[PDB]
Design a protein that fits this description.
The structure is cut from a larger assembly and holds chains A, B, C, D, E and F.
Chain A lengths: L4 H19 L6 H12 L32
Chain B lengths: L5 H13 L8 H11 E2 L3 H15 L10
Chain C lengths: L5 H22 L8 E4 L5 E5 L13 H14 L6 E2 L12 H13 L4 H12 L6 E8 L7 E4 L2 E2 L12 E8 L6 E8 L19 E2 L17
Parallel strand pairs in C: 2-3
Antiparallel strand pairs in C: 1-2, 4-5, 4-6, 4-8, 7-8
The chains are: A mainly alpha, B mainly alpha, C alpha+beta, D mainly alpha, E alpha+beta, F alpha+beta.
The structure holds magnesium ion (2 copies).
The structure holds one RNA strand.
PDB class: ribosome
Keywords: selective stalling, drug-like small molecule, human ribosome nascent chain complex, ribosome
Entry title: Human ribosome nascent chain complex (PCSK9-RNC) stalled by a drug-like small molecule with AA and PE tRNAs
Chain lengths: ~70, ~70, ~230, ~100, ~55, ~100
RNA sequence: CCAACUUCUUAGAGGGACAAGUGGCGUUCAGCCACCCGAGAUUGAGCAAUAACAGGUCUGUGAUGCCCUUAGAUGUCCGGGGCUGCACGCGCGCUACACUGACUGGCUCAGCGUGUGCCUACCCUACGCCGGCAGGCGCGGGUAACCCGUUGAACCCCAUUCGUGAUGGGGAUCGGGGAUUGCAAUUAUUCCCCAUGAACGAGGAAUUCCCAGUAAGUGCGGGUCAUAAGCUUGCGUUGAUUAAG
């Protein structure tokens, strides 16, 4: 799924939180909170997901918010 | 947009007067009290009544609200 | 023969269900008809007519039952009698909206005043345990130009999706001497049974609070070992 | 219409062996469906049953596009006078059922 | 008359032959899923089919 | 005998087929058979759209009717003499059940 | 049983967030603003009141009143034409005016959805072999989380060629040939090839749409459809700027 840059943010997200979940489960959480320190204060959106989505088209214009041109005369 | 409606502000005064001793100043416990004690039709106004009931529980223990 | 897709089966009995509801309305208009309920089986299927006045679909040993399974047979293509009607008196006779919409259909054909007849029926629904209703008569009343009377009496919601099952709407037509009249009855049903006569699933704009108990024994203690 | 005699007997005998028939208002179909064997198109079934209504012996309504009828009891005592059948030979209008 | 050529223009492919299921229009019909109803006709039984809305 | 059967169930409404799901679940497991669970094939939503107006006058409105059909599906193994008490323990007008042929 | 599982795929029940926590503002009243934690501290839309309009629709309706017509019929059918006619004006929309691009070749990643008919007879098509191309041929699945389909979509990415030129930008116009749909392609139905290469160099007064997965670029699937999208309706992608008298 995805695209070209929708995927490379998806694997960046993935292998960032991959070893964090290996470090909750096979090393201590002191070092997990250590590696979570560097990841969160440097542009936090790695291991927390991006929530927003498509926000669907409506029935009076060519997309979600765009509308057709009105003609008064 | 936060301003709370009438039927939530109506239904809180019927609860907290009648069950002042069966409560606390915790939202998540009083959430469970409000479903037990009166039939709420859906979850959204369940914990939205409970929020305003807790908004009075940190409050009517201090001053003369209609208590 | 060969078999079609599920997406065309569900519309096929969706459009089957609408058609006989159209004709039986055209056929049993005079009876307090009020709908159908159909049961499809790999046996004798079972249509039931919810007519109030159940006599007038019967003749001498079911005249207008047997042919009204035969007109359904030789139209839709059933096998030899895998479909049957059953007439069935509906409870709360004037509380389902279609019934008295068909009643005041024929009560306007006798030549009454509209205000006399509607105050007949508006007092008839609201005596019948209805929490609220309102009835609209539209068309050519006094004058060349046509106007519209409405007779709101009772409480009635208008928006949200719970104007789907607290209410029912019925729209019917009455062919009078000039033009066509318009009938439009809507009735709000009581929550009361959690069951038969009304809807379940209470209306979300009110909180049904209950009392606390008798508050017995707050005093100095007691115990029993048993 | 123009009433071919051997065809009208075939539409009457189906209208006599029960009290129903379900012609459909699309007259440009070559083959009437309930008959489908004795080479009748839909115009023959229309304009014969239309002859009956003005005498009153049959009684109709109309569905979406189907053009149903019912048999008034005067129609039964006429259909015996066309088909030479005694007042023992009856339709299914009276009772065959339980 | 003279059935050699009466209904001869071939009612086949084409929207002069597709029709409305309810009471015989041929305009704006819905052949989706094999319903065969004109747009005006479909709305009245809308629920009677079962196509409820978003709500 | 001995067969391999598959029973299907689908409807417009979901709450009715939720109960018919669990009822045949308990109706095999009261006769202590072996069941594989209710497989969740996705919901088929068809979204036919009309222009809401009879004429051409308006401000270009549209309405979006839709019908969501839900479908669920269950295997069993038992012989097919008891296809009657698989059929006739529920009537339920709004559901449409099928049983796949039992040649295994 | 010649393996264990639900993390993604998918639904179902349920949990979840309320402006409760924290400070500040405020009659310490409704509330407002800052952060704490959190996936989320306003997701998008549908039903939408009273009372109206001489708004629209009698050319959907076996809904209908009135009036007209009723056989040298406005009823009905077949045949050809017509709504497509062009001195001109106006309205939605599609392409372009390039170098942030056009070519050529690599390279690559989506979601919604529809698919063979009671009548109605024409569906999506993978594969194989013929052809520079539309297409033709046999052979098979699919009434469908089964087959098409891990839907190898476009923009874009990268390597070459092209260089400020009315240019290989741009494709109107038009001649000739070639294939399928069909009862019939001419007034060109569409598609393909070769050739022809017009304005157009960022647009006057004026005016429209829009504020975050937003505009906008970009393809895709429905609807209509025998053959058909410059439309509309949906989806994905890349993603910002600012009266008790
Ligand atoms: Mg009409
Ligand atoms: Mg330049």
């Amino acid at each position: 799924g995805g695209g070209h840059v929708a995927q490379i943010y998806a694997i960046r997200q993935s292998i960032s939180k991959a070893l964090v979940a290996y470090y909750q489960k096979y090393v201590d959480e002191a070092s997990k909170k250590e590696i979570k320190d560097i990841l969160i204060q440097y542009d936090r959106t790695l291991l927390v997901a991006d929530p927003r989505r498509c926000e669907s088209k409506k029935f009076g214009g060519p997309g979600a918010r765009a509308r057709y041109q009105k003609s008064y005369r | 947009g936060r301003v709370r409606t009438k039927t939530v502000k109506k239904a809180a005064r019927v609860i907290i007067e009648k069950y002042y001793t069966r409560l606390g100043n915790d939202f998540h416990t009083n959430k469970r009290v409000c479903e037990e004690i009166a039939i709420i039709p859906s979850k959204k106004l369940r914990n939205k009544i409970a929020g305003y009931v807790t908004h009075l529980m940190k409050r009517i223990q201090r001053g003369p609200v209609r208590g | 023969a060969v078999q079609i897709s599920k997406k065309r089966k569900f519309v096929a009995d969706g459009i089957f269900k609408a058609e006989l509801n159209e004709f039986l309305t055209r056929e049993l208009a005079e009876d307090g008809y009020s709908g159908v309920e159909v049961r499809v089986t790999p046996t004798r299927t079972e249509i039931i007519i919810l007519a109030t006045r159940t006599q007038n679909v019967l003749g001498e040993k079911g005249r207008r039952i047997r042919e009204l399974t035969a007109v359904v047979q030789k139209r839709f293509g059933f096998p030899e009698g895998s479909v049957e009607l059953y007439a069935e008196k509906v409870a709360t006779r004037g509380l389902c909206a279609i019934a008295q919409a068909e009643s005041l259909r024929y009560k306007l054909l006798g030549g009454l005043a509209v205000r006399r007849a509607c105050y007949g029926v508006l007092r008839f629904i609201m005596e019948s345990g209805a929490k609220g209703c309102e009835v609209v008569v539209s068309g050519k009343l006094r004058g060349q130009r046509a106007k519209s009377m409405k007779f709101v009496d009772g409480l009635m919601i208008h928006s949200g999706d719970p104007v789907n099952y607290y209410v029912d709407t019925a729209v019917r037509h009455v062919l009078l001497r000039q033009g066509v009249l318009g009938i439009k009855v809507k009735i709000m049903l009581p929550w009361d049974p959690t069951g038969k006569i009304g809807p379940k699933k209470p209306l979300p704009d009110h909180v049904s609070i209950v009392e606390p108990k008798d508050e017995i024994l707050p005093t100095t203690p007691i115990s029993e070992q048993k | 219409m123009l009433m071919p005699k051997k065809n009208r007997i075939a539409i009457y005998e189906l209208l006599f062996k029960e009290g129903v028939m379900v012609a459909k208002k699309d007259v440009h179909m070559p083959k009437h469906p309930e008959l489908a064997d004795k080479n009748v198109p839909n115009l023959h079934v229309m304009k014969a049953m239309q002859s009956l209504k003005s005498r009153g012996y049959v009684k109709e309504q109309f569905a979406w596009r189907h053009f149903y009828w019912y048999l008034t009891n005067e129609g039964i005592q006429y259909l015996r006078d066309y088909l030479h059948l005694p007042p023992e030979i009856v339709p299914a209008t009276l009772r065959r059922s339980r | 008359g003279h059935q050699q050529l009466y209904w001869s223009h071939p009612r086949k492919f084409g929207q002069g032959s597709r029709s409305c299921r309810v009471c015989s229009n041929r305009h704006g019909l819905i052949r989706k899923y094999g319903l065969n109803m004109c747009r005006q006709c479909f709305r009245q039984y809308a629920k009677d089919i079962g196509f409820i809305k978003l709500d | 005998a001995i067969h391999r059967i598959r029973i299907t169930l689908t409807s417009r409404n979901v709450k009715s087929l939720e109960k018919v799901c669990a009822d045949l679940i308990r109706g095999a497991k009261e006769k202590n058979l072996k069941v594989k669970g209710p497989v969740r094939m996705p919901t088929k939503t068809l979204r036919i759209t009309t222009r809401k107006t009879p004429c051409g006058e308006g401000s270009k409105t549209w309405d979006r009717f839709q019908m969501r059909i839900h479908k669920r599906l269950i295997d069993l193994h038992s012989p097919s003499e008891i296809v009657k008490q698989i059929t006739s323990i529920s009537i339920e007008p709004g559901v449409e059940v099928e049983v796949t042929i039992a040649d295994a």
